[PDB]
Amino acid sequence: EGLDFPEYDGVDRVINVNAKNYKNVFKKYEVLALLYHEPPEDDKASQRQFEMEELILELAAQVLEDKGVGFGLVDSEKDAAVAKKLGLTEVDSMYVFKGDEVIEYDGEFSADTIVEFLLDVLEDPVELIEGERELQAFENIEDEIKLIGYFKSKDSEHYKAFEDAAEEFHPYIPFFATFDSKVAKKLTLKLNEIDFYEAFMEEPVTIPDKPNSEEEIVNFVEEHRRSTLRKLKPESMYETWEDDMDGIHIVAFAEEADPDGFEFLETLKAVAQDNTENPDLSIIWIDPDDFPLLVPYWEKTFDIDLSAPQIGVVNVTDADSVWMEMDDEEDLPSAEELEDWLEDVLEG
Ligand SMILES: [Ca+2]
Ligand SMILES: [Ca+2]
Ligand SMILES: [Ca+2]
Ligand SMILES: [Ca+2]
């Protein structure tokens, strides 16, 4: 008899966090994920929706039990006093507490993404570059903002300020550091210098006025928080989509694992690089392979075939959209053709 794969065991591990136990709960767990939620309305549908959300947390709780991650619920009415003491303000959101750090979760509510997120939370906020493999891994990061600094040692005042700033964006924005002058020469970094890499960009921008305090780094990252080309990721999809440019998003569908999707993606990078100075411009790359449960909805709402690359303009108010025509029997449009089509659409 072969041993079974792991399965959900039906044992309840999600804690009802209330005024009587919330102090004891925070002492038991190093990392604690709390769902701050309104009580479900009396209709059956609202109870089923909450029933689903709680079981998703139960699954994540079973997977992360051995690593010491706790899961809890905070009722916005029954536990209003707990919400005030913990700083839980945005209802129906999940808050992650890692010691004396509070991390808000801005992603899809599924066991997959929540578990991957919390595993990232558990890691140290700064990743150290020592060997060639670590340096090569840093250079190959392109689908997200990244920062790298060169400091004298882990005990440098300027590294500790860099580490304090990394905790503010943990674990969404990767922070990298080196204390090796050879690695710093390969990255063209002076001592206490921090290079900021916009997503999908080759040239970094140096944070000015080095050495940088924690506040200088935090102010710089927030000011450059929106890259010209951004990828929609499950762990941060709601944050990205709410940062629209005056009510619209330019949306591009491209399956990276597909040869046409890959070619179209390389064109999108060229478009973004050629317009990287434009502050208002926001292009969102969606890989439909990352969101299989939304593909039927997207194909119906936008009247497009996601088996092929697509690009359009979406109105965030009503989901009204317009999508560029592309005939697959010929070459995909060049960056010049894409820029031309976007100009005419946006001119209206
Ligand atoms: Ca509770
Ligand atoms: Ca440099
Ligand atoms: Ca400074
Ligand atoms: Ca840019």
mmCIF file of C-alpha atoms and ligand atoms in Angstrom:
data_model
loop_
_atom_site.group_PDB
_atom_site.id
_atom_site.type_symbol
_atom_site.label_atom_id
_atom_site.label_comp_id
_atom_site.label_asym_id
_atom_site.label_seq_id
_atom_site.Cartn_x
_atom_site.Cartn_y
_atom_site.Cartn_z
ATOM 1 C CA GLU A 1 0.000 0.000 0.000
ATOM 2 C CA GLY A 2 1.625 3.208 -1.207
ATOM 3 C CA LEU A 3 1.705 6.141 1.190
ATOM 4 C CA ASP A 4 -0.781 8.865 0.279
ATOM 5 C CA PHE A 5 0.101 12.408 -0.686
ATOM 6 C CA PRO A 6 -0.577 14.991 2.040
ATOM 7 C CA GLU A 7 -4.195 16.074 2.332
ATOM 8 C CA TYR A 8 -6.219 18.633 4.237
ATOM 9 C CA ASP A 9 -6.965 16.912 7.541
ATOM 10 C CA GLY A 10 -10.010 18.947 8.603
ATOM 11 C CA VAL A 11 -8.459 19.966 11.936
ATOM 12 C CA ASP A 12 -9.261 23.569 12.846
ATOM 13 C CA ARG A 13 -6.121 25.649 13.416
ATOM 14 C CA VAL A 14 -7.377 29.184 12.689
ATOM 15 C CA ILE A 15 -7.705 31.034 15.997
ATOM 16 C CA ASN A 16 -10.650 33.214 16.990
ATOM 17 C CA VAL A 17 -8.626 36.204 18.192
ATOM 18 C CA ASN A 18 -10.540 38.228 20.789
ATOM 19 C CA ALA A 19 -9.954 40.659 23.643
ATOM 20 C CA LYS A 20 -9.197 37.819 26.065
ATOM 21 C CA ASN A 21 -6.590 35.863 24.102
ATOM 22 C CA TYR A 22 -4.999 38.320 21.658
ATOM 23 C CA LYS A 23 -2.070 39.098 23.969
ATOM 24 C CA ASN A 24 -1.324 35.392 24.475
ATOM 25 C CA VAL A 25 -1.624 34.650 20.746
ATOM 26 C CA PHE A 26 0.988 37.263 19.814
ATOM 27 C CA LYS A 27 3.448 35.723 22.295
ATOM 28 C CA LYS A 28 3.052 32.204 20.882
ATOM 29 C CA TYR A 29 3.790 32.960 17.210
ATOM 30 C CA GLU A 30 6.759 34.737 15.665
ATOM 31 C CA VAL A 31 4.718 35.292 12.485
ATOM 32 C CA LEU A 32 0.952 35.774 12.771
ATOM 33 C CA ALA A 33 -1.508 36.340 9.915
ATOM 34 C CA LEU A 34 -4.795 37.975 10.936
ATOM 35 C CA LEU A 35 -7.882 38.342 8.739
ATOM 36 C CA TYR A 36 -9.680 41.532 9.799
ATOM 37 C CA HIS A 37 -13.215 41.037 8.502
ATOM 38 C CA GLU A 38 -16.784 42.211 8.851
ATOM 39 C CA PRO A 39 -19.163 39.560 10.204
ATOM 40 C CA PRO A 40 -21.000 37.855 7.335
ATOM 41 C CA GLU A 41 -24.454 39.126 6.473
ATOM 42 C CA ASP A 42 -27.369 36.879 7.377
ATOM 43 C CA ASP A 43 -28.038 35.641 3.830
ATOM 44 C CA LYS A 44 -26.730 32.208 2.869
ATOM 45 C CA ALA A 45 -24.467 33.548 0.109
ATOM 46 C CA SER A 46 -22.550 35.829 2.485
ATOM 47 C CA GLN A 47 -22.094 32.912 4.893
ATOM 48 C CA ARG A 48 -20.763 30.705 2.084
ATOM 49 C CA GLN A 49 -18.287 33.413 1.043
ATOM 50 C CA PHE A 50 -16.915 33.630 4.586
ATOM 51 C CA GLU A 51 -16.998 29.829 4.841
ATOM 52 C CA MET A 52 -14.726 29.703 1.781
ATOM 53 C CA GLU A 53 -12.267 32.320 3.059
ATOM 54 C CA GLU A 54 -11.912 30.597 6.427
ATOM 55 C CA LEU A 55 -11.186 27.204 4.851
ATOM 56 C CA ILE A 56 -8.518 28.796 2.649
ATOM 57 C CA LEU A 57 -6.844 30.023 5.842
ATOM 58 C CA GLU A 58 -7.242 26.569 7.406
ATOM 59 C CA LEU A 59 -5.377 25.027 4.468
ATOM 60 C CA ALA A 60 -2.579 27.593 4.707
ATOM 61 C CA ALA A 61 -2.472 27.034 8.477
ATOM 62 C CA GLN A 62 -1.944 23.287 8.058
ATOM 63 C CA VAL A 63 0.879 23.775 5.547
ATOM 64 C CA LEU A 64 2.718 26.380 7.647
ATOM 65 C CA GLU A 65 2.139 24.839 11.092
ATOM 66 C CA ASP A 66 5.608 23.291 11.456
ATOM 67 C CA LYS A 67 7.266 26.612 10.570
ATOM 68 C CA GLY A 68 5.494 28.378 13.445
ATOM 69 C CA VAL A 69 3.069 30.563 11.474
ATOM 70 C CA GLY A 70 -0.230 31.272 13.214
ATOM 71 C CA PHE A 71 -3.534 32.271 11.632
ATOM 72 C CA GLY A 72 -6.367 34.189 13.254
ATOM 73 C CA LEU A 73 -9.614 36.058 12.700
ATOM 74 C CA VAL A 74 -10.514 39.510 14.043
ATOM 75 C CA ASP A 75 -14.217 40.395 13.859
ATOM 76 C CA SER A 76 -14.688 44.095 13.093
ATOM 77 C CA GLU A 77 -17.680 44.219 15.478
ATOM 78 C CA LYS A 78 -17.149 41.548 18.147
ATOM 79 C CA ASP A 79 -13.411 42.349 18.370
ATOM 80 C CA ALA A 80 -13.381 46.076 17.597
ATOM 81 C CA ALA A 81 -11.125 46.767 20.592
ATOM 82 C CA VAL A 82 -8.549 44.279 19.285
ATOM 83 C CA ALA A 83 -8.559 45.959 15.866
ATOM 84 C CA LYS A 84 -7.822 49.364 17.408
ATOM 85 C CA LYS A 85 -4.901 48.128 19.516
ATOM 86 C CA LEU A 86 -3.345 46.244 16.583
ATOM 87 C CA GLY A 87 -3.942 49.005 14.032
ATOM 88 C CA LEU A 88 -6.343 47.004 11.841
ATOM 89 C CA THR A 89 -8.095 49.675 9.765
ATOM 90 C CA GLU A 90 -8.759 48.318 6.255
ATOM 91 C CA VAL A 91 -11.595 45.819 6.654
ATOM 92 C CA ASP A 92 -11.646 42.468 4.814
ATOM 93 C CA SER A 93 -7.841 42.596 4.557
ATOM 94 C CA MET A 94 -5.137 40.323 5.960
ATOM 95 C CA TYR A 95 -2.364 41.675 8.195
ATOM 96 C CA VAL A 96 0.916 39.809 8.730
ATOM 97 C CA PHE A 97 2.812 40.446 11.971
ATOM 98 C CA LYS A 98 6.481 39.386 12.057
ATOM 99 C CA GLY A 99 7.713 40.253 15.541
ATOM 100 C CA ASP A 100 7.505 44.052 15.734
ATOM 101 C CA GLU A 101 6.750 44.510 12.018
ATOM 102 C CA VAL A 102 3.305 44.810 10.423
ATOM 103 C CA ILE A 103 2.941 43.712 6.791
ATOM 104 C CA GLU A 104 -0.288 44.250 4.879
ATOM 105 C CA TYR A 105 -1.207 41.619 2.287
ATOM 106 C CA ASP A 106 -2.334 43.057 -1.077
ATOM 107 C CA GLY A 107 -2.734 39.882 -3.131
ATOM 108 C CA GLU A 108 -5.130 37.177 -4.220
ATOM 109 C CA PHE A 109 -6.834 35.226 -1.439
ATOM 110 C CA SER A 110 -5.795 31.663 -2.232
ATOM 111 C CA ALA A 111 -3.804 29.097 -0.273
ATOM 112 C CA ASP A 112 -1.095 29.003 -2.969
ATOM 113 C CA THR A 113 -0.349 32.725 -2.937
ATOM 114 C CA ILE A 114 -0.798 33.212 0.818
ATOM 115 C CA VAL A 115 1.614 30.377 1.636
ATOM 116 C CA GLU A 116 4.221 31.577 -0.872
ATOM 117 C CA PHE A 117 3.830 35.095 0.543
ATOM 118 C CA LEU A 118 4.310 34.005 4.162
ATOM 119 C CA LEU A 119 7.328 31.873 3.239
ATOM 120 C CA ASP A 120 8.798 35.039 1.718
ATOM 121 C CA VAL A 121 7.897 36.950 4.896
ATOM 122 C CA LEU A 122 9.928 34.465 6.960
ATOM 123 C CA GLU A 123 13.137 35.209 5.042
ATOM 124 C CA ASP A 124 15.525 37.965 6.072
ATOM 125 C CA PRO A 125 14.668 41.329 4.468
ATOM 126 C CA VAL A 126 18.125 41.840 2.882
ATOM 127 C CA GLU A 127 19.760 39.220 0.658
ATOM 128 C CA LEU A 128 23.564 39.144 0.751
ATOM 129 C CA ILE A 129 25.606 38.700 -2.431
ATOM 130 C CA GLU A 130 28.821 36.744 -1.874
ATOM 131 C CA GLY A 131 29.311 34.226 -4.687
ATOM 132 C CA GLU A 132 28.960 34.407 -8.454
ATOM 133 C CA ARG A 133 25.666 32.495 -8.370
ATOM 134 C CA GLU A 134 24.097 35.095 -6.077
ATOM 135 C CA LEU A 135 25.447 37.922 -8.246
ATOM 136 C CA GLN A 136 24.122 36.221 -11.385
ATOM 137 C CA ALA A 137 20.712 35.702 -9.769
ATOM 138 C CA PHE A 138 20.508 39.416 -8.947
ATOM 139 C CA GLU A 139 21.352 40.466 -12.501
ATOM 140 C CA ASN A 140 18.650 38.149 -13.888
ATOM 141 C CA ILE A 141 15.849 39.770 -11.856
ATOM 142 C CA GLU A 142 13.835 41.921 -14.269
ATOM 143 C CA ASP A 143 10.081 41.680 -13.533
ATOM 144 C CA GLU A 144 10.276 43.768 -10.349
ATOM 145 C CA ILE A 145 11.982 46.751 -8.769
ATOM 146 C CA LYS A 146 15.231 45.860 -7.008
ATOM 147 C CA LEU A 147 17.889 47.682 -4.990
ATOM 148 C CA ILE A 148 21.550 46.913 -4.342
ATOM 149 C CA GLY A 149 23.963 48.608 -1.961
ATOM 150 C CA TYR A 150 27.662 48.345 -1.154
ATOM 151 C CA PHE A 151 28.638 48.761 2.493
ATOM 152 C CA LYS A 152 31.714 48.206 4.635
ATOM 153 C CA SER A 153 30.196 45.425 6.766
ATOM 154 C CA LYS A 154 26.988 44.207 8.384
ATOM 155 C CA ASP A 155 27.873 46.536 11.282
ATOM 156 C CA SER A 156 28.090 49.666 9.126
ATOM 157 C CA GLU A 157 25.626 52.354 10.183
ATOM 158 C CA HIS A 158 24.696 52.758 6.512
ATOM 159 C CA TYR A 159 23.981 49.058 6.030
ATOM 160 C CA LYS A 160 21.704 49.094 9.079
ATOM 161 C CA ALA A 161 19.823 52.040 7.566
ATOM 162 C CA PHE A 162 19.593 50.053 4.323
ATOM 163 C CA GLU A 163 18.279 47.053 6.270
ATOM 164 C CA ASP A 164 15.740 49.192 8.139
ATOM 165 C CA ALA A 165 14.461 50.458 4.785
ATOM 166 C CA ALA A 166 14.274 46.903 3.430
ATOM 167 C CA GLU A 167 11.930 45.915 6.267
ATOM 168 C CA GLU A 168 9.495 48.655 5.235
ATOM 169 C CA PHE A 169 8.934 47.003 1.828
ATOM 170 C CA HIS A 170 9.381 43.364 2.921
ATOM 171 C CA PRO A 171 8.752 41.120 1.125
ATOM 172 C CA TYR A 172 7.489 42.906 -1.997
ATOM 173 C CA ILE A 173 10.695 44.702 -3.055
ATOM 174 C CA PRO A 174 13.982 42.734 -2.934
ATOM 175 C CA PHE A 175 16.903 44.527 -1.274
ATOM 176 C CA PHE A 176 20.437 43.284 -1.963
ATOM 177 C CA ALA A 177 23.724 44.165 -0.293
ATOM 178 C CA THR A 178 27.402 43.330 -0.673
ATOM 179 C CA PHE A 179 30.459 43.981 1.477
ATOM 180 C CA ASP A 180 32.856 42.742 -1.238
ATOM 181 C CA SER A 181 34.792 45.371 -3.203
ATOM 182 C CA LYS A 182 35.079 42.963 -6.144
ATOM 183 C CA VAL A 183 31.299 42.588 -6.441
ATOM 184 C CA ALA A 184 30.900 46.349 -6.009
ATOM 185 C CA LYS A 185 33.354 46.965 -8.859
ATOM 186 C CA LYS A 186 31.345 44.622 -11.092
ATOM 187 C CA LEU A 187 28.169 46.554 -10.200
ATOM 188 C CA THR A 188 29.926 49.966 -10.462
ATOM 189 C CA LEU A 189 29.034 50.812 -6.856
ATOM 190 C CA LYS A 190 30.969 53.198 -4.645
ATOM 191 C CA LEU A 191 31.001 52.664 -0.886
ATOM 192 C CA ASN A 192 27.574 53.378 0.680
ATOM 193 C CA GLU A 193 26.094 53.806 -2.818
ATOM 194 C CA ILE A 194 22.666 52.323 -3.583
ATOM 195 C CA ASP A 195 21.503 51.599 -7.142
ATOM 196 C CA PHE A 196 17.756 51.411 -7.822
ATOM 197 C CA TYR A 197 16.664 49.233 -10.761
ATOM 198 C CA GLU A 198 13.275 50.012 -12.264
ATOM 199 C CA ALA A 199 11.428 46.889 -13.377
ATOM 200 C CA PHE A 200 12.378 45.718 -16.896
ATOM 201 C CA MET A 201 15.020 48.481 -17.141
ATOM 202 C CA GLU A 202 18.721 47.958 -17.804
ATOM 203 C CA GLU A 203 20.138 51.215 -16.411
ATOM 204 C CA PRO A 204 19.802 51.811 -12.656
ATOM 205 C CA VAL A 205 19.324 55.156 -10.946
ATOM 206 C CA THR A 206 21.620 55.938 -8.026
ATOM 207 C CA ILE A 207 19.953 57.233 -4.867
ATOM 208 C CA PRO A 208 21.438 60.737 -4.495
ATOM 209 C CA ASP A 209 23.175 62.270 -1.478
ATOM 210 C CA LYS A 210 24.971 59.170 -0.206
ATOM 211 C CA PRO A 211 25.383 57.944 2.487
ATOM 212 C CA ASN A 212 21.614 57.483 2.703
ATOM 213 C CA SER A 213 19.498 57.422 5.839
ATOM 214 C CA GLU A 214 16.578 55.022 6.165
ATOM 215 C CA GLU A 215 14.182 57.870 5.353
ATOM 216 C CA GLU A 216 16.083 58.857 2.199
ATOM 217 C CA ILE A 217 15.848 55.294 0.876
ATOM 218 C CA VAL A 218 12.163 54.948 1.796
ATOM 219 C CA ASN A 219 11.280 58.295 0.202
ATOM 220 C CA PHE A 220 13.159 57.342 -2.968
ATOM 221 C CA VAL A 221 11.481 53.947 -3.361
ATOM 222 C CA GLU A 222 7.990 55.361 -2.798
ATOM 223 C CA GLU A 223 8.633 58.115 -5.348
ATOM 224 C CA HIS A 224 9.740 55.509 -7.927
ATOM 225 C CA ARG A 225 7.214 52.872 -6.835
ATOM 226 C CA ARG A 226 5.485 52.658 -10.242
ATOM 227 C CA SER A 227 7.591 51.280 -13.078
ATOM 228 C CA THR A 228 6.639 52.111 -16.657
ATOM 229 C CA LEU A 229 6.092 48.387 -17.290
ATOM 230 C CA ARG A 230 4.745 46.386 -14.336
ATOM 231 C CA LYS A 231 3.802 42.713 -14.169
ATOM 232 C CA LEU A 232 0.502 41.788 -12.540
ATOM 233 C CA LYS A 233 1.452 39.349 -9.792
ATOM 234 C CA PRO A 234 -1.012 37.380 -7.631
ATOM 235 C CA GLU A 235 0.698 38.497 -4.418
ATOM 236 C CA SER A 236 0.139 42.187 -5.225
ATOM 237 C CA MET A 237 -2.522 42.292 -7.947
ATOM 238 C CA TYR A 238 -4.964 44.532 -6.065
ATOM 239 C CA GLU A 239 -2.318 47.133 -5.188
ATOM 240 C CA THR A 240 -1.085 47.307 -8.787
ATOM 241 C CA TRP A 241 -4.553 47.577 -10.330
ATOM 242 C CA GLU A 242 -5.691 50.363 -7.989
ATOM 243 C CA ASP A 243 -2.724 52.549 -9.047
ATOM 244 C CA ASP A 244 -4.305 53.625 -12.322
ATOM 245 C CA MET A 245 -3.291 56.580 -14.494
ATOM 246 C CA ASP A 246 -6.336 58.881 -14.382
ATOM 247 C CA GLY A 247 -8.874 56.078 -14.625
ATOM 248 C CA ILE A 248 -7.287 53.818 -17.260
ATOM 249 C CA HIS A 249 -4.682 51.076 -17.540
ATOM 250 C CA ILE A 250 -2.783 49.980 -20.617
ATOM 251 C CA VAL A 251 -3.037 46.188 -20.351
ATOM 252 C CA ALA A 252 -0.980 43.658 -22.307
ATOM 253 C CA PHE A 253 -1.627 39.913 -22.254
ATOM 254 C CA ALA A 254 1.429 37.830 -23.131
ATOM 255 C CA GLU A 255 2.241 34.231 -22.219
ATOM 256 C CA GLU A 256 5.987 34.265 -21.566
ATOM 257 C CA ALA A 257 6.282 30.512 -22.191
ATOM 258 C CA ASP A 258 4.826 31.086 -25.711
ATOM 259 C CA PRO A 259 7.069 32.120 -28.634
ATOM 260 C CA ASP A 260 4.647 34.822 -29.797
ATOM 261 C CA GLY A 261 3.993 35.959 -26.230
ATOM 262 C CA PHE A 262 7.744 36.116 -25.645
ATOM 263 C CA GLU A 263 8.351 38.159 -28.802
ATOM 264 C CA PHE A 264 5.507 40.525 -27.896
ATOM 265 C CA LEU A 265 6.921 40.866 -24.375
ATOM 266 C CA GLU A 266 10.324 41.881 -25.756
ATOM 267 C CA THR A 267 8.548 44.560 -27.795
ATOM 268 C CA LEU A 268 6.725 45.756 -24.667
ATOM 269 C CA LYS A 269 10.066 46.132 -22.882
ATOM 270 C CA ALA A 270 11.362 48.228 -25.787
ATOM 271 C CA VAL A 271 8.253 50.440 -25.647
ATOM 272 C CA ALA A 272 8.677 50.907 -21.894
ATOM 273 C CA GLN A 273 12.401 51.641 -22.199
ATOM 274 C CA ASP A 274 11.818 54.208 -24.952
ATOM 275 C CA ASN A 275 9.183 55.971 -22.799
ATOM 276 C CA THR A 276 10.699 55.318 -19.358
ATOM 277 C CA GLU A 277 10.909 59.078 -18.724
ATOM 278 C CA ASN A 278 7.144 59.564 -19.113
ATOM 279 C CA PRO A 279 5.835 59.744 -15.522
ATOM 280 C CA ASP A 280 2.136 59.176 -16.273
ATOM 281 C CA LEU A 281 2.643 56.050 -18.389
ATOM 282 C CA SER A 282 1.561 52.767 -16.781
ATOM 283 C CA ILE A 283 1.635 49.484 -18.710
ATOM 284 C CA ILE A 284 0.475 46.314 -16.950
ATOM 285 C CA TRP A 285 1.739 42.993 -18.285
ATOM 286 C CA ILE A 286 -0.606 40.113 -17.447
ATOM 287 C CA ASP A 287 0.607 36.593 -18.164
ATOM 288 C CA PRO A 288 -2.645 34.587 -18.473
ATOM 289 C CA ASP A 289 -0.787 31.492 -17.250
ATOM 290 C CA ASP A 290 -0.583 33.121 -13.793
ATOM 291 C CA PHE A 291 -4.381 33.608 -13.507
ATOM 292 C CA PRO A 292 -6.133 30.506 -14.867
ATOM 293 C CA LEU A 293 -9.400 31.200 -13.022
ATOM 294 C CA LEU A 294 -9.726 34.645 -14.657
ATOM 295 C CA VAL A 295 -9.054 33.650 -18.289
ATOM 296 C CA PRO A 296 -12.714 32.807 -19.120
ATOM 297 C CA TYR A 297 -13.837 36.073 -17.515
ATOM 298 C CA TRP A 298 -11.196 38.087 -19.400
ATOM 299 C CA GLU A 299 -11.998 36.476 -22.750
ATOM 300 C CA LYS A 300 -15.707 37.185 -22.251
ATOM 301 C CA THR A 301 -15.402 40.717 -20.857
ATOM 302 C CA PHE A 302 -12.815 41.921 -23.386
ATOM 303 C CA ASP A 303 -13.912 39.765 -26.370
ATOM 304 C CA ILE A 304 -10.346 38.579 -27.034
ATOM 305 C CA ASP A 305 -8.530 35.259 -27.440
ATOM 306 C CA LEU A 306 -5.883 34.898 -24.735
ATOM 307 C CA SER A 307 -4.080 32.159 -26.683
ATOM 308 C CA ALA A 308 -2.516 35.099 -28.588
ATOM 309 C CA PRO A 309 -0.841 38.297 -27.366
ATOM 310 C CA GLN A 310 -3.151 41.252 -26.791
ATOM 311 C CA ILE A 311 -2.820 44.919 -25.885
ATOM 312 C CA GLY A 312 -5.525 47.410 -25.020
ATOM 313 C CA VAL A 313 -6.729 50.253 -22.827
ATOM 314 C CA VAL A 314 -9.064 49.399 -19.938
ATOM 315 C CA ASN A 315 -11.277 51.836 -18.028
ATOM 316 C CA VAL A 316 -11.109 50.889 -14.342
ATOM 317 C CA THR A 317 -14.571 52.297 -13.574
ATOM 318 C CA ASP A 318 -16.702 50.027 -15.778
ATOM 319 C CA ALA A 319 -14.151 47.643 -17.391
ATOM 320 C CA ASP A 320 -14.904 49.205 -20.779
ATOM 321 C CA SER A 321 -11.962 48.587 -23.069
ATOM 322 C CA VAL A 322 -10.544 48.723 -26.579
ATOM 323 C CA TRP A 323 -8.121 46.129 -27.935
ATOM 324 C CA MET A 324 -5.692 46.417 -30.832
ATOM 325 C CA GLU A 325 -6.329 44.215 -33.849
ATOM 326 C CA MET A 326 -3.516 41.753 -34.562
ATOM 327 C CA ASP A 327 -3.637 39.166 -37.345
ATOM 328 C CA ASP A 328 -1.535 36.149 -36.376
ATOM 329 C CA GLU A 329 -0.837 35.277 -40.032
ATOM 330 C CA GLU A 330 1.734 38.112 -40.103
ATOM 331 C CA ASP A 331 4.386 39.659 -37.879
ATOM 332 C CA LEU A 332 3.446 41.099 -34.513
ATOM 333 C CA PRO A 333 3.351 44.916 -34.424
ATOM 334 C CA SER A 334 6.635 46.687 -33.781
ATOM 335 C CA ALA A 335 7.257 49.054 -30.887
ATOM 336 C CA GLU A 336 6.637 51.931 -33.302
ATOM 337 C CA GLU A 337 3.282 50.474 -34.362
ATOM 338 C CA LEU A 338 2.277 49.878 -30.736
ATOM 339 C CA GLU A 339 3.266 53.423 -29.759
ATOM 340 C CA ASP A 340 1.338 54.751 -32.763
ATOM 341 C CA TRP A 341 -1.835 52.830 -31.907
ATOM 342 C CA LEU A 342 -1.684 53.833 -28.236
ATOM 343 C CA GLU A 343 -1.286 57.505 -29.200
ATOM 344 C CA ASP A 344 -4.440 57.472 -31.331
ATOM 345 C CA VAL A 345 -6.488 55.619 -28.705
ATOM 346 C CA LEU A 346 -5.301 57.855 -25.856
ATOM 347 C CA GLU A 347 -5.713 61.049 -27.907
ATOM 348 C CA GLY A 348 -9.481 60.519 -27.765
HETATM 349 CA CA CA B 1 -11.933 36.957 16.516
HETATM 350 CA CA CA B 2 27.530 52.899 -11.096
HETATM 351 CA CA CA B 3 22.241 61.374 2.637
HETATM 352 CA CA CA B 4 10.321 54.457 -16.219
#
